[PDB]
């Protein structure tokens, strides 16, 4: 019932993945006797992480009990309450590891926020799941309170290997001395479109052009949101006229890949319509249109 924390200089991705996947899981599975313990890899360097999706997949894997009306309180958070309910429930089951989770960069640009740390601290009290994590920053211990350090129950290990870290340095533009707005995340979109099929690229180009038109007509550095999106029916009518998609089934099939990578969102307004929108900035959208999709 401890929690490892690996720190040092270099890249700890390959080490952590090789240790968690190839060694710990089969050994735990054999020691509890059939199938191996599922592992939830949690990328940290990605600026587009969201704890709601992480808790959704945790719920899917563990299947916790639901929340009664008397426990929802008055406009109370529905994540911390469920975590506390799980903690109270798991204090009587037999001590067996049922899930192993790997946090690659515990102090990334988007996982260092207070709410995410609170969720992870509460999730680590449960003795039936195993934590492995790593950090890169040098003022990392400042991030943990006197109460979070109590229930994290950390044990510190040092591993330095001077690894190149060629994967973590993909969401930022190294060519500009690393001052490329790390919290934006627009470089990952370029990297993904570098290796996509021809049909998807044209659809993304059409969506970007329409969203840019709407943003220009409605409003600079303002970010794009639901107010400047495109209706699903209108987008289907537009794309069907360029031999990109035939029916709504194909469009909804090829939109899931873009939705999963946090490069496009679908949501409903007050009037019941469906709006798709890209959470980028006008300058970044123009750069994307000019540098990678201009030539097709």
């Amino acid at each position: 019932g401890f929690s490892l924390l690996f720190y040092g200089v270099g890249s700890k991705r390959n080490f952590l993945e090789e240790f968690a996947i190839d060694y710990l899981s089969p050994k735990i599975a054999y020691s509890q006797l059939v199938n191996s313990i599922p592992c939830l890899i949690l990328n940290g360097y990605n600026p587009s992480c969201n704890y709601r999706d992480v808790f959704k997949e945790i719920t899917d894997l563990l299947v916790p009990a639901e929340l009664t009306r008397s426990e929802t309180k008055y406009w109370g958070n529905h994540v911390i309450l469920q975590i506390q309910k799980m903690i109270d429930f798991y204090k009587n089951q037999p001590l067996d590891i049922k899930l192993i989770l790997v946090v690659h960069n515990l102090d990334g640009p988007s996982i260092r926020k207070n709410t995410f740390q609170t969720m992870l601290s509460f999730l680590s009290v449960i003795r039936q799941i195993a934590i492995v994590a790593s950090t890169d920053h040098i003022y990392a211990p400042l991030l943990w309170d006197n109460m979070k350090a109590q229930n994290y129950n950390f044990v510190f290990h040092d591993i330095s290997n001077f690894e190149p870290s060629t994967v973590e340095s993909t969401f930022q533009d190294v060519m500009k001395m690393g001052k490329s707005d790390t919290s934006s995340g627009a470089e990952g979109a370029k990297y993904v479109l570098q290796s996509l099929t021809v049909n998807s690229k044209k659809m993304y180009k059409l969506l970007i052009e329409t969203q840019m038109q709407n943003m220009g007509n409605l409003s600079g550095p303002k970010r794009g949101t639901q107010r400047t999106g495109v209706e699903l029916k209108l987008f289907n009518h537009l794309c069907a006229a360029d031999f990109i998609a035939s029916n709504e089934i194909a469009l909804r099939s090829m939109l899931r890949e873009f939705i999963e990578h946090k490069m496009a969102n679908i949501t409903k307004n007050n009037s019941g319509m469906e709006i798709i929108w890209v959470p980028y900035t006008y300058a970044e959208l123009e750069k994307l249109l000019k540098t990678v999709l201009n030539t097709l």
């Binding site: 329409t210 038109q213 007509n217 209706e231 029916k233 209108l234 009518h237 006229a241 019941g272 319509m273």
Partner: protein, 130 residues
């Protein structure tokens, strides 16, 4: 708007979304041997497109279909309003007719006023004094 149009062509009473799909299907797939031409008069168009261009795009696009028999007449204040809303290529595809109404002059206005007073001006009246 949607439901109103449907309520004026079918007699049914549906919500706005279902009215939208109903109108789409009616204008797209119903054969031309079992329909009747319709003359819509979309008016004060600038008050509909204030959050999105959905209504204008749908109403203008329904004239593209071959099976439809729609004749839309839309009046507005600004001339180049669709270009500022839809886009140049969509407007070029649609291909509508454009008309501009210039203001009046000091002769036409006087002609209107004089025409509106023809029988009364320079006439005779019986008036009771009491």
């Amino acid at each position: 708007c949607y439901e109103t149009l449907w309520n004026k062509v079918s007699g049914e009473r549906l919500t706005w979304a279902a009215s939208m799909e109903s109108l789409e299907f009616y204008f797209k797939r119903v054969p031309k041997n079992k329909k009747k031409t319709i003359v819509v008069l979309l008016d004060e168009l600038d008050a509909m497109v204030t959050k999105s261009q959905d209504i204008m795009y749908n109403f203008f696009n329904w004239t593209t279909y071959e099976n439809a028999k729609l004749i839309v007449i839309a009046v507005a204040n600004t001339m180049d309003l669709p270009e500022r809303q839809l886009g140049n290529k969509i407007t070029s595809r649609i291909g509508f007719t454009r008309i501009m109404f210039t203001g009046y002059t000091h002769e036409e206005l006087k002609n209107i006023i004089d025409l509106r007073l023809k029988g009364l001006n320079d006439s005779f009246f019986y008036v009771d004094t009491k």
